Amino acid sequence: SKMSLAPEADLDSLIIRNDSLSGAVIAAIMQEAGLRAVRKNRYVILQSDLEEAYATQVKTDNTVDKFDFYK
Amino acid sequence: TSIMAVTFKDGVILGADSRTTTGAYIANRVTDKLTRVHDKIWCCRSGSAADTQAIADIVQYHLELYTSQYGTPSTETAASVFKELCYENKDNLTAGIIVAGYDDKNKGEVYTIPLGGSVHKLPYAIAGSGSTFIYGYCDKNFRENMSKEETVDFIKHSLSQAIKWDGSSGGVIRMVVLTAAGVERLIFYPDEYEQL
Amino acid sequence: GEITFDGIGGLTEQIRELREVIELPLKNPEIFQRVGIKPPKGVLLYGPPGTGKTLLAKAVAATIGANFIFSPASGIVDKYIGESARIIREMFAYAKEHEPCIIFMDEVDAIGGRRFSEGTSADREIQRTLMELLTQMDGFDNLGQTKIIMATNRPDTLDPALLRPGRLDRKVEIPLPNEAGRLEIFKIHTAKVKKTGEFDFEAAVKMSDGFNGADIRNCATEAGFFAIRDDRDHINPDDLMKAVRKVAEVKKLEGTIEYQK
Amino acid sequence: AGYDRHITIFSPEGRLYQVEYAFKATNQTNINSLAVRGKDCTVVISQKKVPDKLLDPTTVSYIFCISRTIGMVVNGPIPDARNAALRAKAEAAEFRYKYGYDMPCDVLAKRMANLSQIYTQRAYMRPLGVILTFVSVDEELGPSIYKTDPAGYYVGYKATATGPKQQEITTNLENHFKKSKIDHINEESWEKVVEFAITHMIDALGTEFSKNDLEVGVATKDKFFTLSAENIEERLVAIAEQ
Amino acid sequence: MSRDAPIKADKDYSQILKEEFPKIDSLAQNDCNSALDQLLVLEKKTRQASDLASSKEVLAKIVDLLASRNKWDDLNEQLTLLSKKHGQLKLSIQYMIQKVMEYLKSSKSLDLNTRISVIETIRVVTENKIFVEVERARVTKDLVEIKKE
Amino acid sequence: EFKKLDDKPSLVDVHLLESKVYHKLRNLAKSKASLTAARTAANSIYCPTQTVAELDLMSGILHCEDKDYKTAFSYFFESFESYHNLTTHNSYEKACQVLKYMLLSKIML
Amino acid sequence: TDRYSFSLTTFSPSGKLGQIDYALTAVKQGVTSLGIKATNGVVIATEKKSSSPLAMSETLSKVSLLTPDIGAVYSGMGPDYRVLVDKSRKVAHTSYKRIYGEYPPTKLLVSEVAKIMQEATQSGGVRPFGVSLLIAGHDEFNGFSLYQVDPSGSYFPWKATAIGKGSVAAKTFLEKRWNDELELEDAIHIALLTLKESVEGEFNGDTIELAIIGDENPDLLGYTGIPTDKGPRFRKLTSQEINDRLEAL
Amino acid sequence: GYDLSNSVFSPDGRNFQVEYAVKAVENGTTSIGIKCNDGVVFAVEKLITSKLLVPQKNVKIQVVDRHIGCVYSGLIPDGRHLVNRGREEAASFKKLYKTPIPIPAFADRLGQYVQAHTLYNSVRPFGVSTIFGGVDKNGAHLYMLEPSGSYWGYKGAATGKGRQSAKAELEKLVDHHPEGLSAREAVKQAAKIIYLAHEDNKEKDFELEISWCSLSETNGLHKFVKGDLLQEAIDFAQKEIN
Amino acid sequence: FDSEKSGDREVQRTMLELLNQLDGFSSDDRVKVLAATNRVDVLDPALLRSGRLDRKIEFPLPSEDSRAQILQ
């Protein structure tokens, strides 16, 4: 709500990835994506920026969706 | 049964008939005996039908694994497989196999394997039981390195005399041509080679 | 221990990355307005030892010239209690009247400790000082032109509330110098010394790996001893090729193994 | 007990940490692969990288020929890659031997899966740390991809990727079949499917390629082949002239 | 790479085709198109450093084409193809495109020809966001003036 | 009696209709009481989309009446997304109506 | 050399075998599945799930065929399910179809599989399969029958039951939903309705795998002119059928 | 405690066992394999530990069948076991197919055998690096085999303590001759770079062994260098390093 | 310097304050270190690095000649 996005960016591609996050790390990724945006030199968050920032400080799990064979 | 293979310039031509008798009764008169165990290394079986077919299956097995691990085997290699299968089952199985195959480097080659099991390289090989009658016809008129046309008419006439004098041999004559170009089947009906 | 924008060669990509967090909101908060993010802050530096993580700290205080303090991990520790809280509380205060400040914690493993206090009383002394930081980092006290650069030599020593993002927003690792990253480091250190003329490093260095950035300057020092032995005043590629053998040899004495997030 | 995870035994959570650890050793070569279905072909690309020049580039490979119609692409360490390749070739020979026709890709997926299961049920087997992609063109099922993993689980796919950064590629494939509204590319020549694949790889990984940085395997009908560098270069040139 | 043979070969060619440039240059008087091909093949390089050198031979050559009043059309298409061919080292091509615009200002062409050539050129770097941008804005304002009148 | 048989997400609707009754009896003290119970019965994640569109609609009208036009506009924006883009059987009239309330909310500010 | 011949399964000091406890926890980790026994058939239903949405799920099965009268469905581990289905077919043929030349009653087969689980609990070098199976079948002497084999190696017959992580809620629903007379049609609607409480994701016939041990199908027999043999009583319903029943709720 | 066995994994992708074996190999002496156009040239540094030894009476290069040289570093008895195993396998192939085993086929065999020792608690992974190669009818080939059960093609391979120096020097040798050199000319080069790889090792004195399998001079069989040729190589290196 | 539940965190704080003044904030270029120690496998990875003890000398067990000298 606070920051600008691009119509290419989506918040629904973030559900499928990890399913245990803290509220600080969601405030963290979006801030980290706002630095990568300036390396492009852009003021709107692209979905390229937004997935790269997820990939750093990802804190991966093997309990969450798209990482399972216990199904 | 009659099988032969004859090398020529550009490769080799394999030749067989298709008559398969048990006793006096022909079980099928259009039977195949030119078998593929690799994609360039074909064989001609004779002897006991059961025995030849079993052995051929096992050799296909080994050659296919050879291809998947080491690259395609050479005619030499396949012949060695047949030899070592015959040598372990010489007292129980009765097989005469002519292994003919195209090597890209050397050309068509012909090895023959008797039933005791040994390899013999030859410029032309015959086996079966319609073959003890055409030995001299082959040997007199053969030269090294004939043309493809020549080779085909050669094997045709040889197998016509075999069919004539052996009653276990007959039916259509079938041929497989192994060359760099590929694999070609030929088939000659009785009306075709009786005239000559 | 001052040096220019460039404090390393071949790891420039990480130098560029650091200033993103520090130098950019310093110059223009207004470009982080356009995005609408919180102005970046908070940095963890961690990596293998001797890799210029501290020399980069000195370089970003030198280059920008923004107000710098500092803290060695253990000169802020006091015998009196409520006195080691006092400094660091009062150090943040200093940071709000002094412009754009940059707080370098050097080699912190002292209060990096976890909850322990089943051991000695020293572990509650750590605890008292640690709680003090959290309230500063986030609360009604919020920063924006006060930045944290935290230098450590292993980050899995720490308490995870000192691994907490939005206090530490970017976690920049500087690895060991790379195959041709040593080459880039060598060309700045052959200018300092007297040399016959040497632009023949390249093969020998890549296949004498095992060096951190400070050992490259120890190849030059040890090559100046091979020179002294010959009674030479110049670094020769005869001297250099015996040096890389020696310097590699003395580091195999103990190993180091470190893993990261 | 103190041992739950040096042997294959459930945890108090009801789980197998060991097998997890196997999945945490598939991203050490850091090779990525991308595999898509044409209309009459299957195309797979993988990275090739050599850390040194003193290697011979030809021998460095990850696309292994199992059957004449089934190609196998491996993600994970190369020792386990070779053990898996040998396993599979054995089973292929044996299928041809006992049933009289070449092994189907589906059957191979499952055979290898069950062997996997056995490595994680015996207390002194170590599981493979490789994800295998089986690419085939069947005549009963059409072009198909089957993926098996160290667990012994396998699943079919329309397209799939593997590697450490394979989420990027997932995005790409997702959007592509979103627009197309169909589960395979409609292309009647295998060349252009190679081209499309390389395009999505350049977009996804963010880095351009060269003939010595690629490795390409194609499954057409009744065959499997690999392209040499010379033919890969041509594909790259025809990409720019789209 | 895995061999060093491309290195030795590529660099060496660069020096020698300076020696053969006067021969090419007289041949362009008889037929430019054939000389154009010879330099085009030359620019196929698998070694980085030789790219910078081989592009300089083409710069001298195309002055003749640019000055002409039919052949500059053909020149605009080439620039397109060059960026596409392989990428061929993102430094080389970016220097060339500039030197050509700089030449255009000094050759002195029709309002019309100037206008239409530039639109073709700014079009190429719309698909790029590398060094091109510096030059792209400068020739954009040069084009602004054209339509200002 | 269906609250001992509380397994169904179709008890959401009943709470909502009770909210409407108090709404046109023009008391919102009890309107909120029945709304809270509607949100409780819709906390189950197995409810259809349509019934959740209804959930936001009722709140949209209600905080509008309470004269908060910041909350009303956010709720009406959510219900516009539901009605507009799924099928229309009465959702043509309900996308129209929600739209008119969005316009009204801004005039008050 | 090898000396894993001592059991990895032991008694816990508090009385229990720890390993089946861990396995039964693992079963509440997996997919949800249920089975309802009607008077004139049995219906089994489960959810199809995959790692990626781009993975195929039609080339994948969670309802498997052991015999033309007997199907199985699992909740728990996929890999463990796969091998054990094959083994069930295996011992069904070698010890009832060579000795009596015909397929086994449901119950007989249930015991055949319970032994395999048992010897996965005994004999070092193994750990239990981490699955619960529903074995639904029909035999001609006890009619329609529904069993549940647990990680332990016991079985129980049920009238209706559910396995997986949503089991507590599902079973409470089926508590009212079960009736002394149920029609196979009604049971189909009921099973879908229950597993809808259990599933969050998209709900179609392409994600809900339905199979019925209903009545015989002479069209699935593959031949005609034999009235003596009849068709499979099992049937897998492909997506088309199931899509009608979404609408008939 | 994930360092205890080979069948354990760790969440870092590590299997500490196998990494530790590399440190056993780091304890061996320099051993080089030069891939030339005509064949392969192996050389081994043989430390002369005492003045009580019989010189040139101990071989660290052993041949398998007759056209594959094998030279190993690390643990000498352990590598000895490995070579014995490879001869068994070679003779098996030779009996079964009537041709001396190809070098890639040999590579498959040894790689599988060493890969095997990480799948069972029962055994210990071999701590040796092997370099083996020769001339077969599809050309000369060179392989270096890890204690991990990994291998690749190589134009030049090395192992030991003075591997640092040797690798760098080989880089140069491929920069001198990007089209390669003669196996005749490579005798002198092996001498050279072993000598250069003994300054890291200059506690001692050593004896140089060289052997080669090339098509042009030994007719494709693995023979040893001796006599005036060997001593000339020695002198060559000696003058270079002085 | 990964310590669990002990007073080793008190000990190491005189290790860390050493590494700080063995860094240059100049006025240590002329100040040196010699160190003797029984064992060299117990050192901290921040003392493998050069800048702390750059030269690393080993004391060997005696030689033939050396032993003779010592007795004398």
Ligand SMILES: Nc1ncnc2c1ncn2[C@@H]1O[C@H](COP(=O)(O)OP(=O)(O)OP(=O)(O)O)[C@@H](O)[C@H]1O
């Ligand atoms: N990359 C470099 N190039 C040149 N000198 C360097 C480099 N990095 C470090 N040094 C030298 O090493 C000395 C000490 O290293 P420094 O204190 O800066 O590093 P560090 O990585 O934090 O490790 P520690 O904090 O344990 O010392 C410096 O004073 C400088 O002479």
Ligand SMILES: [Mg+2]
């Ligand atoms: Mg420091």
